[PDB]
A paper describes a structure:
In this study, we solved the structure of SDN1, an exonuclease that initiates miRNA degradation by trimming their 3′ ends to generate unmethylated miRNAs that can be further turned over. Arabidopsis SDN1 and SDN2 belong to the DEDD 3′→5′ exonuclease superfamily, characterized by an active core consisting of three separate sequence motifs with four invariant acidic amino acids (DEDD). The Arabidopsis SDN family belongs to the DEDDh subfamily. Our structural and biochemical studies revealed the structural features of SDN1 in substrate recognition and provided insights on how SDN1 uses its DEDDh catalytic domain and the RRM domain cooperatively to degrade free small RNAs and trim miRNAs in miRNA/target RNA duplexes or miRNAs bound by AGO1.
Author numbering: 308 to 408
Write the structure that this text describes.
C-alpha cells in the first residue's frame, strides 16, 4: 500500500529558491497536500511532493497542468510550468509523476 501512496504523488523539482513553496499550489488542481524538501546546503533549487487522494486524482491533476510537455534523457515525460511571482519575476519548474511504471 506504500506504492498506492507513491502513485498518488506528483514530483515538483528544479524549483528556484526564490519561489515560495505555497505558490506551487497555484499550478495544481484538485485536492492535495504539498510536502516541501529543504534545499541542500549552499543549494539553489528545491523540490516538493504533491500527494493526492489516489493515483487517478494525481493523473487527472497532471493532465490539467498548463505546461510544456517534454521528455528528459531518461525517457520520463515531464511538464515545464511557469510560476508567476509577485515580484513580476518568474520561474520554470518541472513536474512529473513520482512513479513511472
Amino acid at each position: 500500500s506504500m506504492l498506492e501512496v507513491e502513485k498518488a504523488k506528483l514530483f515538483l523539482h528544479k524549483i528556484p529558491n526564490n519561489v515560495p513553496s505555497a505558490a506551487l499550489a497555484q499550478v495544481l488542481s484538485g485536492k492535495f497536500t504539498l510536502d516541501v524538501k529543504q534545499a541542500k546546503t549552499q543549494g539553489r533549487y528545491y523540490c516538493a511532493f504533491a500527494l493526492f487522494h489516489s493515483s487517478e486524482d494525481a493523473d487527472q491533476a497532471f493532465e490539467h497542468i498548463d505546461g510544456i510537455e517534454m521528455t528528459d534523457s531518461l525517457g520520463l515525460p515531464q511538464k515545464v510550468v511557469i510560476i508567476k511571482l509577485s515580484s513580476g519575476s518568474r520561474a520554470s519548474i518541472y513536474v512529473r509523476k513520482m512513479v513511472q511504471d
